[PDB]
Design an enzyme around this catalytic site. Structure first.
Site, PDB file in Angstrom:
ATOM      1  N   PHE A  98      66.761  73.039   5.273  1.00  0.00           N
ATOM      2  CA  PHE A  98      66.594  72.801   3.804  1.00  0.00           C
ATOM      3  C   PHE A  98      66.130  71.366   3.490  1.00  0.00           C
ATOM      4  CE2 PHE A  98      71.054  71.925   4.631  1.00  0.00           C
ATOM      5  CZ  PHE A  98      71.268  70.715   4.050  1.00  0.00           C
ATOM      6  N   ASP A  99      66.175  70.457   4.472  1.00  0.00           N
ATOM      7  CA  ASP A  99      65.752  69.078   4.230  1.00  0.00           C
ATOM      8  C   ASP A  99      65.549  68.390   5.580  1.00  0.00           C
ATOM      9  OD1 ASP A  99      65.251  66.847   2.575  1.00  0.00           O
ATOM     10  OD2 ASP A  99      67.305  66.458   2.039  1.00  0.00           O
ATOM     11  N   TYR A 146      67.792  62.332   9.118  1.00  0.00           N
ATOM     12  CA  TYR A 146      68.597  63.563   9.159  1.00  0.00           C
ATOM     13  C   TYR A 146      67.688  64.781   9.159  1.00  0.00           C
ATOM     14  CZ  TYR A 146      67.619  64.164   4.192  1.00  0.00           C
ATOM     15  OH  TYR A 146      67.043  64.300   2.961  1.00  0.00           O
ATOM     16  N   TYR A 192      78.514  70.840  -1.427  1.00  0.00           N
ATOM     17  CA  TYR A 192      78.146  71.144  -2.790  1.00  0.00           C
ATOM     18  C   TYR A 192      79.048  72.198  -3.384  1.00  0.00           C
ATOM     19  CZ  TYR A 192      74.137  68.217  -1.975  1.00  0.00           C
ATOM     20  OH  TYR A 192      73.351  67.101  -1.764  1.00  0.00           O
ATOM     21  N   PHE A 200      74.222  69.323   9.905  1.00  0.00           N
ATOM     22  CA  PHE A 200      73.316  68.202   9.954  1.00  0.00           C
ATOM     23  C   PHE A 200      73.254  67.584  11.335  1.00  0.00           C
ATOM     24  CE2 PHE A 200      74.889  68.319   5.602  1.00  0.00           C
ATOM     25  CZ  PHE A 200      73.747  68.258   4.877  1.00  0.00           C
ATOM     26  N   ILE A 236      76.890  63.584  -0.444  1.00  0.00           N
ATOM     27  CA  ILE A 236      78.039  64.490  -0.262  1.00  0.00           C
ATOM     28  C   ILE A 236      79.145  63.779   0.518  1.00  0.00           C
ATOM     29  CG2 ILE A 236      76.718  66.601  -0.541  1.00  0.00           C
ATOM     30  CD1 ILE A 236      76.793  66.922   2.522  1.00  0.00           C
TER      31      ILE A 236
END
Lengths: 128, 5
Positions: free
Chosen positions: A55-56, A45, A101, A118, A75
């Site tokens: 962010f990731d 991802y 979140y 994503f 999530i």
């Protein structure tokens, strides 16, 4: 760009039909089978915030992220979204905060009330 | 934290 496109052109995959999780299939995967509840799923991802920041990313770690599908280990948008994927599929997901979140956010990068984008690749799934 | 929770 891709976040705008999934926002405006994605398909609602929620059971409630509340547009909380929208999906576009970017690369069609293999055959017809999707994972089942409790399967070990292996994903790559990349996640972006609505300010454009990444962010990731699992690619940057050189290892996939592995979790048990449908157990609330991730999530809600990921449990719902990965459950719709075939092996080898790549999709885009656009996740409202109620399927991510929420008002809490998630330190360090995810603010309160954040809509998330994503790109997810389902590498494999296996029953245990 | 992410992508847990």
């Amino acid at each position: 760009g891709a976040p705008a496109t999934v926002t405006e052109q994605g398909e609602d995959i929620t059971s409630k039909k509340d547009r909380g999780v929208l999906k576009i299939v970017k690369r069609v995967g293999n055959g017809e089978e999707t994972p089942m509840i409790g399967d070990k799923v292996y994903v790559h991802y990349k996640g972006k915030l609505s300010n454009g920041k990444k962010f990731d990313s699992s690619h940057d770690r050189n290892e996939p992220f592995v979790f048990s599908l449908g157990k609330g280990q991730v999530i809600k948008a990921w449990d719902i979204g990965v459950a719709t994927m075939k092996k080898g599929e790549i999709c885009h997901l656009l996740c409202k905060p109620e399927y991510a979140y929420g008002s809490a956010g998630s330190l360090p990068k995810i603010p309160s009330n954040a809509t998330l984008f994503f790109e997810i690749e389902l590498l494999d799934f296996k029953g245990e | 934290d992410f992508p847990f929770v």
